[PDB]
Amino acid sequence: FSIPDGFKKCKHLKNFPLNGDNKQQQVWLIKFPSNVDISKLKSLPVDFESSTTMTIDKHDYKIMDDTDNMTLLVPSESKESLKIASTAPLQFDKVFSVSETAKIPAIDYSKVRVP
Amino acid sequence: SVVGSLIFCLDCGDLLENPNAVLGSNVECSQCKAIYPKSQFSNLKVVTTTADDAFPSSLRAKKSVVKTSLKKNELKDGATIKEKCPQCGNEEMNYHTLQLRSADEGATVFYTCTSCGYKFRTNN
Amino acid sequence: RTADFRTLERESRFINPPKDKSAFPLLQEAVQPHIGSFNALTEGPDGGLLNLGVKDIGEKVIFDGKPLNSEDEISNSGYLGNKLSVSVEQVSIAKPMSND
Amino acid sequence: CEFKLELAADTEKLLMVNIVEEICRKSIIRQIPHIDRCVHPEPENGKRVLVTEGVNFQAMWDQEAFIDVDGITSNDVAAVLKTYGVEAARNTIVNEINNVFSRYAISVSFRHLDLIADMMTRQGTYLAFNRQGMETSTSSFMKMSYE
Amino acid sequence: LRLTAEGNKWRTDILKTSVDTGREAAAEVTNLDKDTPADDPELLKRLQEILRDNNKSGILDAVTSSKVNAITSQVVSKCVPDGTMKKFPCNSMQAMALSGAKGSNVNVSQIMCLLGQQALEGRRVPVMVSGKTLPSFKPYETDAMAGGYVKGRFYSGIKPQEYYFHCMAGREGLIDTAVKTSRSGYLQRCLTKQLE
Amino acid sequence: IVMTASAAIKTPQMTLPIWNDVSDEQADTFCKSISKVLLSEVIDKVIVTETTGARSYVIHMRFFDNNEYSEEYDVSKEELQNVISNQFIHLLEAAIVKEIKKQKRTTGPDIGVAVPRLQTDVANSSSNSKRLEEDNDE
Amino acid sequence: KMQYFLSTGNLVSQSGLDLQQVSGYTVVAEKINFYRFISHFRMVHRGSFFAQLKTTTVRKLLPESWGFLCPVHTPDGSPCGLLNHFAHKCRISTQQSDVSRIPSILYSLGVAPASHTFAAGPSLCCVQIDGKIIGWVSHEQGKIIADTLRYWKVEGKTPGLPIDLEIGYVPPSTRGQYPGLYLFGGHSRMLRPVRYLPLDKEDIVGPFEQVYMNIAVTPQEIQNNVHTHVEFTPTNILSILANLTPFSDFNQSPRNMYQCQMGKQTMGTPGVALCHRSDNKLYRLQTGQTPIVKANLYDDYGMDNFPNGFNAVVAVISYTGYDMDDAMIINKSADERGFGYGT
Amino acid sequence: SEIEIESVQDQPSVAVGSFFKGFRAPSDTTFDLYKKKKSEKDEFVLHGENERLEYEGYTDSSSQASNQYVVGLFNPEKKSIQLYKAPVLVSKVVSKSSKNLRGPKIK
Amino acid sequence: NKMSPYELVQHKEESDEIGGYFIVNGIEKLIRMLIVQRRNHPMAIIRPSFANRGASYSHYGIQIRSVRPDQTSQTNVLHYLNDGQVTFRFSWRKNEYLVPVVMILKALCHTSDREIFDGIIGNDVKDSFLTDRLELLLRGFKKRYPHLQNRTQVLQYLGDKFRVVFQASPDQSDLEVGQEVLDRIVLVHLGKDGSQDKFRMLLFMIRKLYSLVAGECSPDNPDATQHQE
Amino acid sequence: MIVPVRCFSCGKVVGDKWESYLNLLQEDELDEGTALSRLGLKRYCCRRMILTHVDLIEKFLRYNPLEKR
């Protein structure tokens, strides 16, 4: 109902080319933070196991995977409409979560033990 | 949308009332109007399980995999000091580790005679 | 050597107390639980503790007994008084001074 | 065991687990009364004895094939007085007092204890030393000057 | 207050394996055998199980201190009449304690041989929530030392760990003094008014 | 002993001198004949599966092996039945109706009532404030 | 109304605090020497209610007092245990610290935020700061964060990370303390300095971290794969007064606790401002002498400014027969030539 | 161990928000999404208007510096993942009968 | 304060002046430091001194001492009942008050009852000790207060019974009294602007409490120098 | 306070040597024990009165109640 001003309604919107047939079109649950630049990387190591330890821009990157609930809300033509593209609500499939870890340098045990 | 033994709603988000005390084949919410005029989940059951470690006995003491209690020989002390005994002559005599009085008094770090059951006090 | 005894810095200090540095600093660190705890009443962001303690008690209000005496409305019968607020917004201990 | 309790409709949900946890700790399968836990101790002075953490003389007489029933000794003096006369209530007291000064190895003489036990057992009953025990006396300033 | 150096050799090689006397007490309690090493992933799990109980891990005390006071047998029975630097009739430290003047052979041995275990109220050194008795120890430690066995003597001085355990034997002993002050004050004047 | 006229001692005892013919187990059987047998001693688990139809409560039990309780506490498997048929149910059927009555009288206390205070004992709510600071010399 | 609180000790309140007793909040800082007067500021009382409970759990020496509360320095008698003092290096946080930077670092590590997650249980690790639940991770996650936040702290990374912050990681254990990773930076904690072994700097550790650390004592005794921390001196754990005992590990510890009790009630120098002061009683020793058998921390506290006692040529001898049961026999011509003279 | 990315997109079309599990509202309505504007991550609206419910919501405001969820799409001849990115609604559900506040006084 | 040892002799004090005390009519006095429980950490106490408070009150419980940022102390005890109905506890002036927990949990943020429910239900459905103890806590409150549905309405009742013992002013409605109760008592680590975050800690002081009455969490000992400040 | 006149145990007059250790380190410029050896230093039944004395009379005299400032 837009009780404070500055709320703008949405007029023109981009196209959402989902088919979801019956080849086969899957709407996954890939995830992204903002601490890295978005359009910077096109090389992305990820798998099903924890074989995802990455480093771009000198940081201890990784994908945190944990499969074990949210919503899709599309427009139809031009009004935003938050239509739930579905079969009868939507269910999520895969956890592609971009993450960042941080690791210590190695323990120098050998130094400080004075004999 | 029932998990465990709790009947719920699709609109309001409340625990619906227990399907036994309700009228014939119908349950509903109190905030919104829960659409279950069929009582689709009018059949319910749940398992419980007791805490099996709330009944201690001496038989669980044998059902454990470590030494829960002593046996009639499993305490063989060896605090041998070579002090003379007057009542049974057992030179062997243990100690016990205390310090009784206020600090104007010596070591109250006891003895105990080991053959006739005589008790000894390390006064000073 | 392993260590050192002292008998001339002690006499460099009795006759000549230090000007710019309080000597033996482990003693002034030994009462820092008590000195610094009374400092934090005044020193602290948003005015310190007592200036933060007083903005957690600020409204003890009551009302009078006269009607507002407008037209005979809903708000002239069932009305008691006007709003009056005692409040405390800032407190400070000054310093010990002395005057007749 | 297996038994399926049925209950009503207007009855609401109840926990069932905790009540069985309480009652199973309350049931006594085989309790001889006022007696909890007999135990065979380390053999003392060669005397093959037992120790019973409860006092019931009347049921132990009925166990005569394994207990010599003419040597049983307790610490509940107010139970020996009820069953075994007053003269055994006197010989228990000089034992039970001497069972405190012996564990700390303080050999108080029996002549002091025979006097105390024959003062408590002067009226045939186990009279304590207190306000109620002094209530039978003659010299009445002694009563006022106690408390 | 000084022996010859042979009493250390009399104790050390078995005081070194006194960590495997505590360990051999830590194996008899857990009902394992075959002299397993202390960092076994199943030995710790049993010892974690006997840490959350009170009566269990009371037995672990009473098995250990019974076994590790037998080291004090093997030190007191060989040193103090013989290993001392001054023999008895000139030895003034024993001439008092072995005549009834002042002190006894505990106070002889705590000066010359060793202190021994500083067991609190019969059991042993208390334990933290983790499984350490001090922050200087590996948790769930199977040792005489973390059990509070104090190898040193008061002549050569006691280490920072076992000093702290010996102060536990003070602070729980002194508080018996402030808890008895009028126990038998009423009781004796309860008799002399009736046996008056 | 000396005072207070001990009718109910907190910790009583009784020494029983056994005969001479009796052996150790023939007395160690006999300790197991006298001592009390809680029904909590012979039970490992109690499975309770709840259902409704019309509320119904299945109650199952799990005792131990028969060569243990009958050789630790001298209790047969029909002496167990003779308790559950007679002592256990009536105590249990008491403590269901006894606890259902709490459901049927008032469905909760009234919020707004101030009870007496929390960390205060009912004997002056304090120990002392004038002498508990003295050292042993003082 | 405020001075009346500081005269009698009564904590009068028509409203009422959250404490349970209303007396004994303030005492008389006596001046009977300089040891007694400095130890008022270092003393802490357990609480005036616990004198009721004669169960000695509130009175017993406990292993978590390592380096915070002195094992020796407490009086005998009735408050023996309720009246134990701090340590030589137990420094207390007064101001709080900054927490506007730290949650931006936990989310930078593998911590999921509080609202997006919908998870609980002991089987996860609840990350908290000052009683504000913010996250959920696994037990092997916070096991690394308790090393990762320690590197990021003692080095120079961001001024938002303080050094008074305690990282109370509770490792999971079978039916033990509740597992979680607990941060506190606020007012009124107990902190002492230790030596952190990798990236060797001086580190600060609370009494809630120290329940789950393996802090070695001497660097002769540092083992492998267990010790992350060592202490600068093992005499960072005693009091000031108990440290001043010469060869204080050779004595029998009920004569160390007795030493701090008869070390306060001597007569030394209450002060040197005695011309411009006024007290009810001032016991002053005339001929003050420093000890020859002294401590290395005797000089840094500056106890030469208040010499409590004197050096006397002692003959350990039984010669006269007027000395048993702790009696001693003075030299008369020492006394007639001035010996412990005092007004 | 590689999956490509189609492109980058931000513009307001789709909201991605968390709720309580077991919620089938009648889907015979559209929703509104309105946009306060400040040239960073903007406060976004839930607007669920059917004939039985009238509820609303908000997006979060504290931890928006390390988080912007995503809806992506897959194609088994291209084998990539695209972006339809969304700050998360953490909102709630009420009805128009849950507005009956009563008399706060006694008269 | 910023005064030289050389200048402390100029104004006649000891050159190594301690300070840090009061002079109250010549008698040099000081406030003794005391040992109290660590702030902002929910302890897991067991205590036999809870059984005095009535029948069915257990011996367990969760104790927290949330200090305010101006150092004001406030304890919010959280008991456990055999009946399943967990009762919150606090103190306002000199008295002791008991409320059902879901009444607070409805009042902190605007929750539906399944939002309360599935709020507690994070995972571990299959535990029969979570999913059964949790029922009577929800079943009783719907039975005890059927006419208190949403947060605006539960504050009508909470500020109602606690109106006059808080001595609030007649311009304040029953919800505005109740909001001030929720801003003066329960979990005062934040006060206002944290009524979402004050919810997430009472989901943590229950899941701790249910992990105590089963015994998966051993109770903390307050003497042990680790929960006390 | 000031240096004692007589040695307590022995009895030698020890109000004599209190003053030569600045000049032992400023005029003679030594280390400690070399300056603690020469000038008549003889018996460690009274050599203490060099090492042991504090001379607290210097700290009192700055608190003069009889002079301006």
Domains of chain J are 1-69 (1.10.10.60)
3-class DSSP string for chain H: CECEECCCCCCCCCCCCECCCCCCCCCCCCECCCECCCCCCCCECCEEECCCCEEECCECCCCCCCCCEEEEECCCCCCEECCEEECCEECCCCCCCCCCCCCCCCC
Rg of chain C over all Cα atoms, to the nearest angstrom: 29
Widest distance between CA atoms in chain D: 76
Question: Does B102 sit within 8 Å of F42, measured CB to CB?
Answer: no
Write the DSSP symbol of residue C4.
Answer: -
Q: Are strands G166-170 and G180-184 parallel, antiparallel or unpaired?
A: antiparallel
Q: After which residues is chain F broken (C to N over 2.5 A)?
A: 53
Tokens 């010469």, located at residue: G246
The answer for residues whose C-beta is within 8 angstroms of residue G87's C-beta and 6 or more apart is: G67, G68, G69, G70, G192, G236, G237, G238, G239
G73 and G131 belong to one structural domain: no
Write the DSSP symbol of residue I97.
Answer: E
Q: Which of residues 32-71 of D touch I (CB under 8 A)?
A: none
Rg of chain F over all Cα atoms, to the nearest angstrom: 26
From J15's Cα to the closest Cα of chain G, the distance in A is 13
Count the Cβ atoms, other than its own, within 10 Å of residue F136. Answer: 19
Q: Tokens at residue B63, please? A: 């059902």
Determine the angle formed by the axes of helices I113-120 and I101-108, rounding to 10 degrees.
Answer: 110
Question: What is the count of residue pairs from F and G with beta carbons less than 8 Å apart?
Answer: 48
Per the structure, the count of domains in chain A is: 1
Task: Please give the helix or strand (H or E) that residue G129 lies within, else none.
Answer: strand G125-129
Chain H CB within 8 Å of residue A87 CB: no
Question: Does E196 sit within 8 Å of D142, measured CB to CB?
Answer: yes
Chain G CB within 8 Å of residue J44 CB: no
I134 burial via Cβ count (<10 Å: 0-12, 13-18, 19+): buried
Domain extent listing, chain B:
1-124
Question: DSSP per residue over E99-139, as a string?
Answer: TTSS--HHHHHHHHT--EE--STTT-S---SSS-SSTTS-T
Give Cα G130 distance to the centre of its chain: 23
Q: Is B113 annotated as a binding residue?
A: yes
Question: DSSP per residue over chain A, as a string?
Answer: ---STT-B------------------EEEEE--SSS-GGG----B--SSS---B-SSS--EEE----------B-SSSS-TTB-----------EEEEEE---PPPP-TTTT---
> Which of I53, I97, I154 is the best substitution to test chain F (most F C-beta atoms within 10 A)?
I97
Widest distance between CA atoms in chain F: 77
Question: Does I143 sit within 8 Å of D15, measured CB to CB?
Answer: no
3-class DSSP string for F34-62: HCCCEHHHCEEECEEEEEECCEEEEEECE
H43 contacts A11 by C-beta, under 8 angstroms: no
Mark A96-114 as b/e (b = at least 16 C-beta within 10 Å): bbbbbbbeeeeeeeeeebe
Chain H CB within 8 Å of residue G104 CB: yes
The answer for residues whose C-beta is within 8 angstroms of residue C63's C-beta and 6 or more apart is: C80, C81, C82, C83, C84, I169, I170, I171
E72 contacts E114 by C-beta, under 8 angstroms: yes
Rg of chain I over all Cα atoms, to the nearest angstrom: 23
Q: What SS3 state is found at G7? A: coil
> Cα separation of I136 and D121, whole Å?
60
Chain D CB within 8 Å of residue F73 CB: yes
C-alpha pair distances (Å), D108 with each of B15, D87, D120, E190: 75, 22, 18, 18
I53 contacts I59 by C-beta, under 8 angstroms: no
> Cα separation of I222 and I64, whole Å?
12
G99 and G181 belong to one structural domain: yes
Q: Tokens at residue G313, please? A: 């040529």
> Cα separation of B18 and B44, whole Å?
10
Count the Cβ atoms, other than its own, within 10 Å of residue B117. Answer: 14
C-alpha pair distances (Å), E181 with each of B101, F4, G77: 11, 21, 11
I69 contacts C52 by C-beta, under 8 angstroms: yes
Q: Domain limits at I188?
A: 40-221
From B103's Cα to the closest Cα of chain F, the distance in A is 9
Chain B CB within 8 Å of residue H25 CB: yes
C-alpha pair distances (Å), E23 with each of B71, E27, E32, E34: 20, 6, 11, 12
The answer for residues whose C-beta is within 8 angstroms of residue B10's C-beta and 6 or more apart is: B1, B34, B35, H22, H23, H24, H25
Chains that touch J (3 or more CB pairs under 8 A): C, G, I
Beta bridge partners of F49: B47, F58
> Cα separation of I22 and I29, whole Å?
5
First-to-last CA distance in chain F? 35
Question: Does F131 sit within 8 Å of G24, measured CB to CB?
Answer: no
Q: Domain limits at A42?
A: 1-115
> Cα separation of I212 and I209, whole Å?
5
> Cα separation of G320 and G303, whole Å?
36
From G298's Cα to the closest Cα of chain B, the distance in A is 25
Chain I CB within 8 Å of residue J69 CB: yes
Closest CA in chain I for residue F122? I52
**Residue among E50, E63, E33 nearest E140 (CA):** E50
Q: Which of residues 96-115 of I touch H (CB under 8 A)?
A: 110-112, 114-115
**Residue among E145, I38, I221 nearest G60 (CA):** I221
Q: Is B116 annotated as a binding residue?
A: yes
Task: Please give the helix or strand (H or E) that residue E62 lies within, else none.
Answer: helix E59-68
> Cα separation of G65 and G239, whole Å?
12
**Residue among J46, J45, J59 nearest J17 (CA):** J46
First-to-last CA distance in chain G? 38
Tokens 């002294």, located at residue: G294
> Cα separation of G337 and G316, whole Å?
22
Is the dihedral angle over the CA atoms I37, I38, I41, I44 positive or is it negative?
negative
For the sheet containing G125-129, what is the strand order? G112-113, G133-137, G125-129, G180-184, G166-170
> Cα separation of I106 and I152, whole Å?
9
> Cα separation of I229 and I208, whole Å?
22
Chain J CB within 8 Å of residue C2 CB: no
Phi, psi torsion values for D52, nearest 5 degrees: -120, 125
Question: DSSP per residue over A11-26, as a string?
Answer: ----------------
Residues of H in contact with A18 (CB under 8 A): 73
Long-range contacts of E18-21 (CB under 8 A, 24+ apart): E18/E68, E18/E71, E18/E144, E18/E149, E18/E151, E19/E142, E19/E143, E19/E144, E19/E145, E21/E67, E21/E68, E21/E71, E21/E144
> Cα separation of I213 and E119, whole Å?
33
Q: Tokens at residue E32, please? A: 């394992």
> Which of I144, I160, I177, I185 is the best substitution to test chain F (most F C-beta atoms within 10 A)?
I144
> Cα separation of G98 and G93, whole Å?
13
H78 contacts H94 by C-beta, under 8 angstroms: no
Count the Cβ atoms, other than its own, within 10 Å of residue A28. Answer: 18
| Header resolution in angstroms | 3.7
Is the dihedral angle over the CA atoms F63, F69, F73, F74 positive or is it negative?
positive
Beta bridge partners of A62: A99
Q: Domain limits at G86?
A: 20-94
Q: Tokens at residue J17, please? A: 């040597």
I215: domain CATH number? 3.90.1110.10
> Cα separation of I130 and I58, whole Å?
18
Write the DSSP symbol of residue F87.
Answer: I
Residues of D in contact with E195 (CB under 8 A): 115-116, 119
> Cα separation of I77 and H36, whole Å?
43
G80 and G158 belong to one structural domain: no
The beta-carbon neighbor of G292 closest among J1, J51, J59 is J51
Residues of H in contact with G115 (CB under 8 A): 60, 90
**Residue among B80, B110, B86, B112 nearest E78 (CA):** B80
First-to-last CA distance in chain B? 77
> Cα separation of G279 and G284, whole Å?
12
From E175's Cα to the closest Cα of chain B, the distance in A is 8
> Cα separation of E170 and G242, whole Å?
15
> Cα separation of D101 and A7, whole Å?
92
G235 and G180 belong to one structural domain: no
Pick the CATH number of E1-159 from 3.40.1640.10, 1.10.132.30, 1.10.3720.10, 3.40.50.300: 1.10.132.30
G107 contacts H63 by C-beta, under 8 angstroms: yes
Phi, psi torsion values for J59, nearest 5 degrees: -75, -20
J10 burial via Cβ count (<10 Å: 0-12, 13-18, 19+): exposed
Question: DSSP per residue over I161-224, as a string?
Answer: HTSTTTT--TTS-HHHHHHHHHHHTTTTTT-TT-TTTTHHHHTHHHHHHHHHHSSSSPPPPTTS
Chain G CB within 8 Å of residue A101 CB: yes
Q: Are strands G166-170 and G91-92 parallel, antiparallel or unpaired?
A: unpaired
Residues of B in contact with I113 (CB under 8 A): 13-15
Question: DSSP per residue over G73-111, as a string?
Answer: ----STTTTTS-BB-SS-EE--S----SSSHHHHTTTTP
I35 contacts I214 by C-beta, under 8 angstroms: no
For the sheet containing F55-60, what is the strand order? B45-49, F47-52, F55-60, D2-6
Q: Tokens at residue D66, please? A: 């394994």
**Residue among I113, I116, I121, I135 nearest I199 (CA):** I116
**Residue among B102, B96, B104, B103 nearest B122 (CA):** B96
D56 contacts D93 by C-beta, under 8 angstroms: no
> Cα separation of G230 and G203, whole Å?
10
G71 contacts E164 by C-beta, under 8 angstroms: yes
C-alpha pair distances (Å), G327 with each of F96, G253, G323: 75, 22, 5
Count the Cβ atoms, other than its own, within 10 Å of residue G328. Answer: 7
C-alpha pair distances (Å), F125 with each of F11, G19, G26, I33, J10: 31, 12, 20, 22, 63
Residues of I in contact with D14 (CB under 8 A): 136
The three-point CA angle G165-G168-G170 to 5° equals 170
Tokens 């009762």, located at residue: I87
Which parts of C1-100 are beta strand (E)?
A: 60-62, 84-86
> Cα separation of G82 and I30, whole Å?
18
Q: Is B123 annotated as a binding residue?
A: no
> Cα separation of G304 and C9, whole Å?
11
**Residue among I117, G251, F107, A75 nearest H14 (CA):** A75
> Which of G95, G99, G241 is the best substitution to test chain C (most C C-beta atoms within 10 A)?
G95
Is the dihedral angle over the CA atoms C6, C12, C17, C18 positive or is it negative?
negative
Chain G CB within 8 Å of residue J53 CB: yes
Q: Tokens at residue D43, please? A: 């053999």
Long-range contacts of G143-150 (CB under 8 A, 24+ apart): G143/G169, G143/G171, G144/A103, G145/G106, G145/G109, G145/G110, G145/G111, G145/G169, G145/G181, G146/G181, G147/A104, G148/A102, G148/A103, G148/A104, G148/G109, G149/G105, G150/G196, G150/G203
Question: DSSP per residue over I24-81, as a string?
Answer: ETTEEEEEPPB--BPTT--B----GGGGGG-TTB-S--BB-B---TT----B--B--B
> Cα separation of I126 and F48, whole Å?
15
**Residue among E50, E58, E16 nearest E31 (CA):** E50
Write the DSSP symbol of residue F115.
Answer: B
Closest CA in chain D for residue B18? D12
> Cα separation of F126 and B113, whole Å?
45
Q: Is B29 annotated as a binding residue?
A: yes
Q: Judge J/H contact: 3 or more CB pairs < 8 A.
A: no
Closest CA in chain E for residue F1? E187
How many residues are recorded in chain D?
A: 147
> Cα separation of J18 and G190, whole Å?
46
From J44's Cα to the closest Cα of chain I, the distance in A is 33
> Cα separation of I136 and E52, whole Å?
31
C73 burial via Cβ count (<10 Å: 0-12, 13-18, 19+): exposed
Q: What SS3 state is found at J47? A: coil
> Cα separation of G96 and G93, whole Å?
7
Q: Is B61 annotated as a binding residue?
A: no
Question: What is the count of residue pairs from G and I with beta carbons less than 8 Å apart?
Answer: 174
